[PDB]
From a paper:
[name] E3 ubiquitin ligases regulate a wide variety of cellular processes and are particularly important during innate immune signalling events. They are characterized by a conserved tripartite motif in their N‐terminal portion which comprises a canonical RING domain, one or two B‐box domains and a coiled‐coil region that mediates ligase dimerization. The RING domain of TRIMs adopts the canonical RING domain fold that recognizes the ubiquitin‐loaded E2 conjugating enzyme (E2~Ub). To understand the role of self‐association and gain insight into the mechanism of [name]‐mediated ubiquitination, we have analysed the properties of two [name] ligases, TRIM25 and [name], which differ in their domain architecture with TRIM25 containing two B‐boxes compared to a single B‐box2 in [name].
In contrast, a fragment that is extended by 10 and 9 residues N‐ and C‐terminally, which are predicted to be α‐helical, is dimeric at all concentrations tested, suggesting that [name] might dimerize in a manner similar to that of a number of homo‐ and heterodimeric RING ligases such as the BRCA1/BARD1 complex, where N‐ and C‐terminally located α‐helices form a four‐helix bundle (Brzovic et al, 2001). The extended RING domain of [name] crystallized as a dimer with a significant proportion of the dimer interface formed by two α‐helices located N‐ and C‐terminal to the core RING domain, respectively, that form a four‐helix bundle. Dimerization buries 970 A2 and the dimer interface is formed predominantly by hydrophobic residues located within the four helices. RING dimerization through a four‐helix bundle employing regions outside the RING has been observed in a number of dimeric RINGs such as the BRCA1/BARD1 heterodimer or the Rad18 homodimer (Brzovic et al, 2001; Huang et al, 2011). The RINGs of [name] are constitutive dimers even in the absence of the rest of the remainder of the protein or additional binding partners. In contrast, we could not detect activity for the monomeric [name] core RING domain. However, the extended dimeric RING showed a similar level of activity as the B‐box‐containing fragment, which was further enhanced in the tetrameric [name] RBCC construct albeit to a much lower extend compared to TRIM25. In support of a more general role of this acidic residue, mutation of the equivalent E16 in [name] also disrupts catalytic activity. This effect is similar to the mutation of I85R, which interferes with dimerization, similar to V72R in TRIM25 (and EV2).
Residue numbers in the entry:
A (entry chain A): 7 to 54, 58 to 70, 74 to 90
B (entry chain B): 7 to 55, 58 to 87
The structure:
């Protein structure tokens, strides 16, 4: 099966702070709109729900689901 | 950045029917629990409908697949 190499790099780092996702600090969080931002960038919007900056839908108030696809890919437990 | 190759293969195919995700037929759909199943397998579980995830027993309440979010990460990868 094919795969896009440039797109694979984009999805592994937060589109805001441009740092690569981690399991704890920059944990990839799934907004209800489907876009993914890290936990730290998500904390900035926690000062008040949360409005996604790419599509203008808002995510309600952390019981947010993790981006399980990203976490499995960057898993290096072995 | 590093990445798990075997895990990268797992996430690019439906964990139920073992078919690789596509953009239309086997479109990867995001359940509310965070797990992803293809568009075709989801119709089978919506035929018996909410939708029950077969890996974690959480339920997703939908009446049409257009209400479920796509897995934007998978779709970007296979674009
Ligand atoms: Zn970030
Ligand atoms: Zn969004
Ligand atoms: Zn399937
Ligand atoms: Zn589940």
């Amino acid at each position: 099966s094919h795969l896009n190499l440039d797109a694979l790099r984009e999805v592994l780092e937060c589109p805001i702070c441009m740092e690569s996702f981690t399991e704890e600090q920059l944990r990839p969080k799934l907004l209800h709109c489907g876009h993914t931002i890290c936990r730290q960038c998500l904390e900035k919007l926690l000062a008040s729900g949360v409005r996604c900056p790419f599509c203008s839908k808002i995510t309600r108030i952390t019981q947010l689901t993790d981006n399980l696809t990203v976490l499995k890919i960057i898993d290096t437990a072995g």
